[PDB]
Design a protein around this nucleic acid. Sequence first.
DNA 1: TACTTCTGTAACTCAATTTTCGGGTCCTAGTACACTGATGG
DNA 2: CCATCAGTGTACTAGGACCCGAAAATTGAGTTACAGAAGTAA
Lengths: 215, 303, 97, 52, 179, 365, 201, 88
Amino acid sequence: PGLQTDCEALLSRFQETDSVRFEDFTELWRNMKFGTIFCGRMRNLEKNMFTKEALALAWRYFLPPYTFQIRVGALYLLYGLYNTQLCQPKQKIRVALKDWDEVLKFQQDLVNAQHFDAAYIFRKLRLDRAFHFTAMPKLLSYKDPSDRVMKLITSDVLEEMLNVHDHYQNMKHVISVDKSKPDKALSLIKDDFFDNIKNIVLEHQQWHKDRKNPS
Amino acid sequence: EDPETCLQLNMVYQEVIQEKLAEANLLLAQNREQQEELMRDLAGSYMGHFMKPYFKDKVTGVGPPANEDTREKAAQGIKAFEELLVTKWKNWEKALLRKSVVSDRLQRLLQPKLLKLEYLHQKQSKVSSELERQALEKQGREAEKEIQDINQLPEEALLGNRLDSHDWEKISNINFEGSRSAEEIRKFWQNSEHPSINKQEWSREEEERLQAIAAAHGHLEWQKIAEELGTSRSAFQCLQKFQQHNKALKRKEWTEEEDRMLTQLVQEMRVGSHIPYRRIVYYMEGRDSMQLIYRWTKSLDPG
Amino acid sequence: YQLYRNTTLGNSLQESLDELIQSQQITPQLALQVLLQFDKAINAALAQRVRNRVNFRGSLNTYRFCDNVWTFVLNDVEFREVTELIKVDKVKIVACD
Amino acid sequence: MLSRLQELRKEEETLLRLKAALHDQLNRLKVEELALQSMISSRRGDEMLSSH
Amino acid sequence: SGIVPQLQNIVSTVNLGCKLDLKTIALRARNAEYNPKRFAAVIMRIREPRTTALIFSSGKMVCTGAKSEEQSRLAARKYARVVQKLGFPAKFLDFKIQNMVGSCDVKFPIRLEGLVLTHQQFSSYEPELFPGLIYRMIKPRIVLLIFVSGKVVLTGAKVRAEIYEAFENIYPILKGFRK
Amino acid sequence: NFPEYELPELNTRAFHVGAFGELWRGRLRGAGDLSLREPPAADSDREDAAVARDLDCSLEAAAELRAVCGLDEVIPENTDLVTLGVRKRFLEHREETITIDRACRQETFVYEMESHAIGKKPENSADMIEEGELILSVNILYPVIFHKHKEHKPYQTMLVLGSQKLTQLRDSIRCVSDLQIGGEFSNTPDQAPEHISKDLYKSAFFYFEGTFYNDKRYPECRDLSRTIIEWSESHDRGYGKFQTARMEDFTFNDLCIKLGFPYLYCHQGDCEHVIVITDIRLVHHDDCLDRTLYPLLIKKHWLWTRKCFVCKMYTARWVTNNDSFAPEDPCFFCDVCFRMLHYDSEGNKLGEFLAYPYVDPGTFN
Amino acid sequence: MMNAFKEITTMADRINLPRNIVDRTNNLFKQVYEQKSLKGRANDAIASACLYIACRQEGVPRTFKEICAVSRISKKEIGRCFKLILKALETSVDLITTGDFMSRFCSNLCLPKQVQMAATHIARKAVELDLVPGRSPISVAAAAIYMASQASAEKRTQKEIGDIAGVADVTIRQSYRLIYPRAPDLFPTDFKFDTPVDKLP
Amino acid sequence: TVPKLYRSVIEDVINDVRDIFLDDGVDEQVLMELKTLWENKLMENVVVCQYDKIHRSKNKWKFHLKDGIMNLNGRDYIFSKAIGDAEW
DNA sequence: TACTTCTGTAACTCAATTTTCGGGTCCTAGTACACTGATGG
DNA sequence: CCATCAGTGTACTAGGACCCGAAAATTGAGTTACAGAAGTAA
Ligand SMILES: [Zn+2]
Ligand SMILES: [Zn+2]
């Protein structure tokens, strides 16, 4: 009942700072008084149910296909929510087996990137034993996602491609027995590969922006 | 200088682009697996299909035959859950019962005379005589008069005397669509819903007479109590009224042994702050949940 | 209807009526009238006195249709009443409507 | 849930376009390699005219 | 191509040569059906050739469901023998195969719209009435039901060679309209 | 095997619980996370050193992280958010519409059942559960006692212990069908009560994904699944390749099942319950750590209790059919009314009726 | 020969179709009465078949269910007589396209012109992309109309579309699920709406 | 259940024919002894029934039977609806 | 009074259409049951 | 001061129509024989 809106607003206000430090998250927590989200008269049953829902939502936002900034913000959100609970038996974040690899590699990347704040937050969460290592995220009965284009093509990939291409042109210039002209048997190389991929990516982002722009 | 350098650079370029192609193809395979998951979501599908007949056919819809243990259990007269299922008698159900009984009696009283009239007509068809034909016509007129008399019979004389055998099983099928068994309908009609059972509100004089008769005659022969009460009442109604106005039904006074029993039962059947008093009552003799609630909240509470 | 005068009930009625005829205690016209009345009564009772569904599986050996009567002969048949099973080697089903 | 469906299908079309471009690149690379083999064979044929 | 149609049904007729009392056959046959209020023939079924025979009072029997000419002839002879055992002077005269229905799959989707556009004088494609294109082949008097799934059903032929030649004639057109 | 969605959000592919538990324990092997111990200036230095070694950072950096990342009720609530605003409006509405404002009996009952045994340490220290025991949050669907059970299915959820022999949950599932007393006591109600159905019919079996684990522990037990297997072996019923077991040489750790998929548990002839495994998780330190009582009833439906049709003060100790006094054919009486209505002076039944001992499902289940 | 032109005129009036179609239907009826290759068929059925043929020929085809609802015979006889007339007259009719039933279907409904164009484009692109192989054009038109209405401001349920187009809601669902995943690329690029095309039932 | 139905049928038939017995000139004692004889004498598998729908697939027969009395293994059973399947 | 069509049965094909079949779905209306809140002798 | 006895706040029932989707079944056309009844048409 509006909890998802609060979580999304907090994550957006964290990402707009373009920062990973826990100091910004703490400042946002104090300004928004998010620690009072659990405040309010509610008996133990509904209290723990709401805590379960909040932890599940935060963990869902912490996992892919969200961006790195959103994932780290959701990590701080999980830390703050779990550490600030009114339930005597603090509710635990449900962790599935299939998602353990993603979380472990995310932590490894965080520590590798010198983002010691998020790594220490995750380590504190693990040490406190705040995780219920279940089989599936939820009991079974009866945004800012991440795109694959950036994984496929980015600045470094195209830089390497064009470096290879220009080196290729140079060795073609030097291979021919005569310096005047290259051999007629090797002239099929395409110069529009970079242009073609640029066209594809610009069309993709144009579609994306005209999509997220309302009619 | 020599195209060998062209070969080396070229297959290393092919290797890098082939690694890129393999990664892209793995992404495509993952995307198509996601799409397959999504279509099976569209093609996916309850708890109700299992409840009592977990194993059931998809052509007949019947489960496996009852186990020999089930047959032995039925032999010992252990009522199943569906056999002990009780449902209240709705007002429309009562009216339907009345109408169905009236129609049943009309049909049962008409079929004999109608068949007699049909036989008389058949005899008239082949009589090969005239004076005998006129006599048969007179008999048919008498039969038709009897049929008319039966048709115009009043409801009071048509209902019966709450002890005559009607076709209660037909009512369970034609009139009722099967929601009530034949025996249930028979018992409800004979004991409770018959007009010969006084359903009017009890009077103070009637209640006093019932109490006096129960005291003098004993509280064990309620059939004779109802018969002697004068008014047309069922033994069940008399017993119900006596109990609802009785004063020895509950013990009305607490004892040390009863307090100890209540404390032991509460400590045994507690799950925390939830104390189900209804479940505690039935190990207590002649007690109600309100009495236990008051006793455990006011006196036997440790606090 | 000339269909239900073949079972145990209808047969026994037939021999009882015959026994009265040979005893000179009843006339054949009344006998046939009673037979027609029994047919009507049994039809009405079965259509209105009975509520229970059976399901039978078998390998239909033969069938036959004529003058509005089906005559199935099935082999290795199993009937399923409310809860019990009845297995028979061969069964004949005579249907008429 | 059509939002993620459309996002995924559009990514699918984009990555099929990338695969088409890369497959054309690979085909032309293989044609170039065949030309390389042919012309290197022809050129090396000029020095086995004097062998032991 | 290398694929050939597989016969699914063969309708043949024979003259038993004597009038029949359908009531007696219905009352004495093993698997006969006789409903004069629904049809004027006795419907008999047999298991070994898996065929259905309609027997008429005039003595003309129609056997259907056979998957081969020899099977159809054997089924017709079986029905003739069955009628003979019932006390009738039934013979086997004028046995003729009247229809041959076969099915096949060219194994590729077909564009029916283009086919009807370029073969308007033969094909009749009405999606409202039937989801399949009806091609009235002219060289052999055969009718082909052609579906977008590639399945082709040939009907109306009296000989197997007719079906084979009709499929050979139709296959190039379908290949040219390969969706 | 890895548990994955067989259905989008409804079911999981069949996997061995043993492999899943082994994977979980190997991915947390020696990580200091599976402890099962109660939570505990000198320790600050050790914590800083541990952070430094785990995160490849300096001691001063570890101290800075520890000090800066520290933790960061009161009835009034102001400057509300959208969800907090909704909660405030709901509280105001409840205050203005309610006069007592207390937890309802159902709420307290559910909470106490859920939290009946949390953090309860063993009295012996020898039944302590090992670090990682694959708790199964099973649920048993109640039988169709009242008619409305068909519409909405009530269930009782039990936290079964992994690597726990079967027949330990079967002996723990509390159902009224095991307390049924057979025979008819119309002639005299003072007969010695016949052995409860729990003793006469000890047979029972689980069915988990095409495998009938029959409870053949006792000599009185015999294969109930034999009838089902023979029924399936008949002409054709789709079901096939049925398996069999003994149910005492198998444990929940050795079971291959799905999550959220209805499996069967039959006992007392034909009393059938739907077994659904909501989820499987490793044992934590904030839940029960005992093994003597771990087959623990976490929730029960609190069924209704039948009342005597004569007096509405007591339950139904007897059920009468074909009664010449009752209005309804199946009529429910307590001992007092039944005795007063069905026996003249010494136990001679008055009229005609078939009386049976009735155990209230809402009292013993 | 009479009592058929009057019946044809009554059928045309029940549809409010123009007089040129009526004249073509009368010409076809006179022709088929001249060949008499289908003498055994009822005159009313021949008139209905001629009316359907004329409507199909002039470029405003109707559906067999839209002639059955007007005529006194069932769709089976209408189709049989249609085929018989096409065989006897030795003439042919161009195959119906999904865009022919767009204008009438969307005019019977209160959908705006923008939604009509959107549905027409969706259906044309869907048939071009082979998303509905071998399915009747009317079902595809109904599915396109449904998606266009659900995405647009004015929403219509499957029932109303089925009644207007004479297509069972089950057929609408079957033809809608085939084009369900490809909803956006079928829509016009410049299409305004209040309910996102990105989310639909 | 079958004995109850048989008894009810006997009672109905007797009640219906009592009028003919009275009219034609035979005493009701003959009726009573008829009832007693029928009841006393009441003490190949054949099913006599009525067909609601005999569906025939390629080889699968589906029988929908309105009502019937069957004589399986020398024991009489009654059904008000039969849904059976068979393979020829 | 002719002079037609229209039934079955067979057999594959496909889409469209209907049927129906178990279960759910939502909504109004009592129902149980621990607790409160005086209430009176 | 220990019993009373309406109210109270729920989930849990009770009927009461009512809907949603899936699976099976049907229809519909294509051939061709065959005999007899319907169904207009003249
Ligand atoms: Zn049980
Ligand atoms: Zn009582």
